[PDB]
Amino acid sequence: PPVLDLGALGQDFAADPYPTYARLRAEGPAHRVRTPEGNEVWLVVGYDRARAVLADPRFSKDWRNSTTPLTEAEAALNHNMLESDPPRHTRLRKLVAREFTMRRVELLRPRVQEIVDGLVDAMLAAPDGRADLMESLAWPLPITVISELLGVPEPDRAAFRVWTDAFVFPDDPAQAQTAMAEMSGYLSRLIDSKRGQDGEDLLSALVRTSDEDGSRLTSEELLGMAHILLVAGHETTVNLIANGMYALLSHPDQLAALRADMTLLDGAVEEMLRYEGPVESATYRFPVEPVDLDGTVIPAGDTVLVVLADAHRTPERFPDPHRFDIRRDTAGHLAFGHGIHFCIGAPLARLEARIAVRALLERCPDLALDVSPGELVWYPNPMIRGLKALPIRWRR
Numbered sequence: 001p002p003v004l005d006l007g008a009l010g011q012d013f014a015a016d017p018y019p020t021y022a023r024l025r026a027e028g029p030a031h032r033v034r035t036p037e038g039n040e041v042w043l044v045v046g047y048d049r050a051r052a053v054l055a056d057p058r059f060s061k062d063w064r065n066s067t068t069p070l071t072e073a074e075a076a077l078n079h080n081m082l083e084s085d086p087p088r089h090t091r092l093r094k095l096v097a098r099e100f101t102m103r104r105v106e107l108l109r110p111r112v113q114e115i116v117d118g119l120v121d122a123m124l125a126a127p128d129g130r131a132d133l134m135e136s137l138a139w140p141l142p143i144t145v146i147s148e149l150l151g152v153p154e155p156d157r158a159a160f161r162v163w164t165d166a167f168v169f170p171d172d173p174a175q176a177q178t179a180m181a182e183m184s185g186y187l188s189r190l191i192d193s194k195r196g197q198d199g200e201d202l203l204s205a206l207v208r209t210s211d212e213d214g215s216r217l218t219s220e221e222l223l224g225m226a227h228i229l230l231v232a233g234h235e236t237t238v239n240l241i242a243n244g245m246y247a248l249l250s251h252p253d254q255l256a257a258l259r260a261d262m263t264l265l266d267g268a269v270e271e272m273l274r275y276e277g278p279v280e281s282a283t284y285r286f287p288v289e290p291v292d293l294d295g296t297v298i299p300a301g302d303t304v305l306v307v308l309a310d311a312h313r314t315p316e317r318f319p320d321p322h323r324f325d326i327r328r329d330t331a332g333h334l335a336f337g338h339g340i341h342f343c344i345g346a347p348l349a350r351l352e353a354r355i356a357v358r359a360l361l362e363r364c365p366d367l368a369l370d371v372s373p374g375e376l377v378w379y380p381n382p383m384i385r386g387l388k389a390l391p392i393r394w395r396r
C-alpha cells in the first residue's frame, strides 16, 4: 500500500490506536508508516509475529545495522545493553543480572513499602479528597526507588521529570537533544563523584567494575549503563501504575472483585500489563538482511517496531481481548518483551506496582476516577502509552 500517516489521524488515534492496529493486522504482519514525530518506520502487528520478531536474531538492536543516523548527543549514550547484540549484550547484562533477581529485589520490599506509605499519607492530607495520581504517586515512587538504588542525591532528582518529559513529549526536536546533553553531563559528574568514595550503591559498584578492567566495562558503557537503568525503568513503571489504576477504576466490576479478594492482586497487575501496559511498541530493531514477512520484504537497515499493544489484542491468543479481566490467563504477554532482552527490571516493576495498587485500594475508601475517560489525555507517541494526568478522589 502507500505509507500511512499516523500524525494525520486524530488525537483519537492517540486516545485509542487499537482499531488502526487491528485493521493493519487483518491486511498482514508488516506495514510502513510515518510517526506523528515524522519518522518512516515499519510496524509489526499480530501476536505470533510479534513474539517471533522479538526473539529473531536477524533483527539487530545495534545501531551499526541501521541506516538511520544518530546525533552526537544520542551517540554518546548508545553504549547500553538494550541497544546491543551478542556478544556485547551478553557481557553487559552479566554485570547487573545478580542485582535484579527476584530474591534480591525482594530485599527492597520494606523500603519500597515505606516510600509508598509516605507518598499516600501525603496524598490523603489533601483537604477536598482529590489528587492527581501522577504527581502524588505514579511519578515519585519509581524515581525515588531507582534513585536510592543508584545513588542519585535527593536535590538532583527533579531534573529527571524534565529530561524524560522531553524524550517522550518534547516541545521540539532541539530540546530533546539539549535534555540528552544535559543528562549525559550530569551522569558523568555523578559517576566521577562516586570514584574513590567506597560507596555501596549500584553506581559506585559499577564505577569500581569499570576502573578494575576497562575491557569489561568501558567508561562510555559505564555512562550508558547508568543512563539505561534510569530511563528504562522509570518512564515505564510510572505509566504502568497510572494506566493500571486507570483500567481498574474505569472497570468498577473488576475493582470490586479485587477489594473483595486481595489474593487477586498479582493477577490484576499482570492484566494491567496485558491490557494497557506502558510499552505500546518495542524499541527499535534493524534487520541485518532483507527479511520476508508473508511476502512483505523489509529491507536491511530499516527501523522496525513490534507493536506489543496489538499482540495483546490478538483474539486467537487472548480471548475476548477488549475485556479487562484480572483473572485472565496472562502468561505470554509481551509487556516485558521476549527473548534475550526480556526486561531485567520486571521483578522490581512488579514489586512497586503491586505495593502501590494495594496501598491505594486499602487506604482510599470509595476511591474513584475524578473525570470522565473521554476527558483524559494520552501522549500521542506510538511507543509509549501514557496519560498527561490522572485525577482521582476518595471519601473525606
Ligand code: HEM
Pocket: 054, 081, 082, 083, 093, 146, 228, 229, 232, 233, 234, 236, 237, 238, 240, 277, 278, 279, 282, 283, 284, 334, 335, 336, 337, 338, 340, 341, 342, 343, 344, 345, 346, 348, 349
Ligand atoms: C512497568 C515496568 C516495565 C516495563 C513494562 C518494562 C518493559 C521493558 C521492555 C518491553 C523491554 C524490552 C524492550 C525491547 O526488547 O525492545 C525492557 C528491557 C529493559 N528494561 Fe524494562 N520495563 C519495565 C521496568 C524496568 C525497570 C524498573 C528497569 C530497571 C530498573 C528496567 C530496565 C530494563 C532494561 C535495562 C532493559 C534492557 C535489557 C536487555 O537489553 O537485555 N525496566 N523493559
Ligand SMILES: CC[C@H]1OC(=O)[C@H](C)[C@@H](OC(=O)c2ccccc2CN(C)C)[C@@H](C)C[C@@H](C)C(=O)/C=C/[C@H]1C
Pocket: 063, 070, 074, 075, 077, 078, 079, 082, 083, 164, 167, 168, 228, 231, 232, 235, 236, 279, 283, 383, 384
Ligand atoms: C522499555 C525500554 C525503554 O526504552 C528506552 O530506554 C529507549 C532505548 C530510549 O532509546 C534511546 O535512547 C534512543 C532512541 C531512539 C534514537 C536514539 C536513541 C539514543 N540511544 C541510542 C542512546 C528512548 C526511546 C527513551 C524514551 C522514549 C523512554 O522513556 C522509553 C522508555 C522505554 C520504552
